[PDB]
């Protein structure tokens, strides 16, 4: 069956502690709509209750201990989280947990550390001599104590920080001194070594760090019975470390543990180098395709639809790419904002859901909407597309990316899925028609538009060709009536 995951969260979810409860009660529904895997938001304690989770204070606190002014995380308690995972599991849905290992924020205390300032545009270059700063690198976890783990963090487990409590100076990046201290290598090259990003940067070359995060990885997997991971900020993390961390977890638990890393860079060559350096042992989000979809939706129809897949990861690396329309990085208001316009969104979803290449992901923000930024729920338009993927998107595929506005592709379906086979067509401009081959053995069949956009039927001729139609700025997916 065609796998389909769902990012079950967006950046502006309410801080009401009922998100795990919602996931729990949505499990049965998700299963019926075709979702086979769910990527849950950071389940640990952030810098505050409000934290989306990427602040990453305590990875062993899943809304179980009183820390950072709260017991529950933004999403709920450990109990409520476990209830959600159980619900998904009982409904046959896999669970992918988010993983944040690049840094830690909200240190319990400070430490005086010898450091040097570095060029923020070239972290390889030091711009100050050595001197002592007060850095937030002490993590004792008073609320948790040693429950689950007695590992405590100190300055030497980090490579640097961006804040000196003593001399509160802005626009600074500090690199810690010490034997062997240096920015980790084989990370993105923007700003000449993008090891540092925010908060206290974790030293991926320190032996205790390597062993500890690996131990945490397995504890995390076993505690929540995870089936996979969504790995955060991989371009800022030692490439070989991530590769080996994953292998360690797979080796220890014995589970395949699917994993998709977010290497956020609209650069195919950079992502390909990342896959190479990680020995292709996990997939990556197709960020390049995201920008293609964004640009097409932003072109008022002037985008050349023939090249919508050009430069994407899924075009050259189909089984190592997780395709997506939007996510918390691109939604309205965020730094990397590049939200795919709603008029084009159904087309984008048809692109990633009805084609054979890539592992598609549905964005919670798109499905249930983003109330805070006026983005309406588009499940009514996505549900039919998920239906098409679930029962009709199978078999040999034929592509027709031969027109600047109207493009499409077909699937001949296969014996393993009854009535399977489809023909999606879309136009980022005026509507029209296109003759497409769905298979001679389908001769005589009468197809209909599962999206409901076009109300008539299309009959496949004796040669297996059908003249499919589509409306302006829309998509139609024809299937056996």
Residues flagged as binding site: 102, 159, 182, 184, 195, 201, 203, 205, 236, 301, 303, 404-405, 428
Of the candidate residues 58, 61, 117, 184, the single one contacting Ca ion (CB under 5 A): 184
Residues 411-430 that bind Ca ion (CB under 5 A): 428-429
Distance of CA 281 to the CA centre of its chain: 17
Q: Decide: is 172 part of the binding site for Ca ion (CB under 5 A).
A: no
Active site residue 232: yes
Q: Decide: is 186 part of the binding site for Na ion (CB under 5 A).
A: no
Residues 298-337 that bind Ca ion (CB under 5 A): 301, 303
What span, in angstroms and rounded, lies between the C-alpha atoms of 1 and 36? 9
- Binding region for Ca ion (CB under 5 A) out of 171-179, 182-190, 257-265, 309-317: 182-190
**Residue pair 414/316 in contact by the 8 Å Cβ criterion:** no
Q: Decide: is 203 part of the binding site for Ca ion (CB under 5 A).
A: yes
Residues 142-161 that bind Na ion (CB under 5 A): 159
Interaxial angle between packed helices 239-253 and 207-224, expressed in degrees from 0 to 180 and rounded to the nearest 10:
40
Q: Decide: is 108 part of the binding site for Ca ion (CB under 5 A).
A: no
**Residue pair 388/479 in contact by the 8 Å Cβ criterion:** yes
Q: Decide: is 186 part of the binding site for Ca ion (CB under 5 A).
A: no
What span, in angstroms and rounded, lies between the C-alpha atoms of 361 and 383? 13
CA neighbor of 440 nearest in space, from 410, 481, 477:
410
Q: Decide: is 227 part of the binding site for Na ion (CB under 5 A).
A: no
Residues 359-398 that bind Ca ion (CB under 5 A): none
Q: Decide: is 162 part of the binding site for Ca ion (CB under 5 A).
A: no
What span, in angstroms and rounded, lies between the C-alpha atoms of 94 and 3? 10
Nearer to Ca ion, 373 or 403 (CB): 403
Phi and psi based region of residue 148 (left: phi greater than 0; alpha: psi -120 to 50; beta: remaining) = left
Residue ranges at the known binding site for Ca(2+): 102, 159, 182, 184, 195, 201, 203, 205, 236, 301, 303, 404-405, 428
Q: Which does 98 bind (CB under 5 to 8 A by kind): Ca ion, Na ion, none?
A: none
To which residue do tokens 């904002």 refer?
337
Nearer to Na ion, 182 or 443 (CB): 182
Q: Decide: is 201 part of the binding site for Na ion (CB under 5 A).
A: yes
Q: Which of 212, 262, 286, 326 is catalytic?
A: 262
Of the candidate residues 58, 117, 184, 326, the single one contacting Na ion (CB under 5 A): 184
Of the candidate residues 186, 195, 366, 449, the single one contacting Ca ion (CB under 5 A): 195
Nearer to Ca ion, 369 or 429 (CB): 429
Q: Which does 404 bind (CB under 5 to 8 A by kind): Ca ion, Na ion, none?
A: Ca ion
Nearer to Ca ion, 71 or 198 (CB): 198
In the complex, minimum distance from the CB of residue 277 to Na ion, in angstroms, rounded to a whole number: 16
- 322 phi and psi, to 5 degrees? -105, 110
Of the candidate residues 26, 108, 162, 195, the single one contacting Na ion (CB under 5 A): 195
Q: Which of 232, 326, 412, 449 is catalytic?
A: 232
Instruction: Count the site residues for Ca ion by CB under 5 A.
Output: 14
Active site residue 262: yes
Q: Decide: is 162 part of the binding site for Na ion (CB under 5 A).
A: no
Q: Which does 286 bind (CB under 5 to 8 A by kind): Ca ion, Na ion, none?
A: none
Residues involved in catalysis = 232, 262
Binding site for Na ion (CB under 5 A): 159, 184, 195, 201
Binding site for Ca ion (CB under 5 A): 102, 159, 184, 195, 201, 203, 205, 236, 301, 303, 404-405, 428-429
């Amino acid at each position: 069956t065609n796998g389909t995951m769902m990012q079950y969260f967006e950046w502006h979810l309410p801080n009401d502690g009922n998100h795990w409860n919602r996931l729990r009660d949505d499990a049965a529904n998700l299963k019926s709509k075709g979702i086979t895997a769910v990527w849950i938001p950071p389940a640990w304690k952030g810098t505050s209750q409000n934290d989306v989770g990427y602040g990453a204070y305590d990875l062993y606190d899943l809304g179980e201990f009183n820390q950072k002014g709260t017991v529950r995380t933004k999403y709920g308690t450990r109990s409520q989280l476990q209830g959600a995972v159980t619900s998904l599991k009982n409904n046959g849905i896999q669970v992918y947990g988010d993983v944040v290992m690049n840094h830690k924020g909200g240190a319990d205390g400070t430490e005086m550390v010898n450091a040097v300032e570095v060029n923020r545009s070239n972290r390889n270059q030091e711009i100050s001599g050595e001197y002592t700063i007060e850095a937030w690198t002490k993590f004792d976890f008073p609320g948790r104590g040693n429950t689950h783990s007695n590992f405590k963090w100190r300055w030497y487990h980090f490579d640097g920080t961006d804040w000196d409590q003593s001399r509160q100076l802005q626009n600074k990046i500090y690199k810690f001194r010490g034997t062997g201290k240096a920015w980790d290598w084989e990370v993105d090259i923007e700003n000449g070594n993008y090891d540092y990003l925010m908060y206290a940067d974790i030293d991926m070359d320190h032996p205790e760090v390597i062993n500890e995060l690996r131990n945490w990885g397995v504890w995390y997997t076993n505690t929540l019975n995870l089936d996979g991971f969504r790995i955060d900020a991989v371009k800022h993390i030692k490439y070989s470390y991530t590769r080996d961390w994953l292998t360690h977890v797979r080796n220890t638990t014995g589970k395949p543990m699917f994993a998709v890393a977010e290497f956020w860079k609209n650069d195919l060559a950079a992502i390909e180098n990342y896959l190479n350096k990680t020995s292709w042992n996990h997939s990556v989000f197709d960020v390049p395709l995201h920008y293609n979809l964004y640009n097409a939706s932003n072109s008022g129809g002037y985008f050349d639809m023939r090249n919508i897949l050009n430069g994407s990861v899924v075009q050259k690396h189909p089984i190592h790419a997780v395709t997506f329309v939007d996510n918390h990085d691109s939604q309205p208001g965020e730094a990397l904002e590049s939200f795919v316009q709603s008029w084009f969104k159904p087309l984008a979803y048809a692109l990633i859901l009805t084609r054979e290449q890539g592992y598609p992901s549905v964005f919670y923000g798109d499905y249930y909407g983003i109330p805070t930024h006026g983005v309406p729920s588009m499940k009514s338009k996505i549900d039919p597309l998920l239906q098409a993927r679930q029962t009709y998107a199978y078999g040999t595929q034929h592509d027709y990316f031969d027109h600047h506005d109207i493009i499409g592709w077909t699937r001949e379906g296969d014996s393993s899925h009854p009535n399977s086979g489809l023909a999606t067509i879309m136009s980022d401009g005026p509507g029209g028609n296109k003759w497409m081959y769905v298979g001679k053995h389908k001769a005589g069949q009468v197809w209909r538009d599962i999206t409901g956009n076009r109300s008539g039927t299309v009959t496949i001729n004796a040669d297996g060709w059908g003249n499919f139609t589509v409306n302006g700025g829309a998509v139609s997916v024809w299937v056996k009536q």
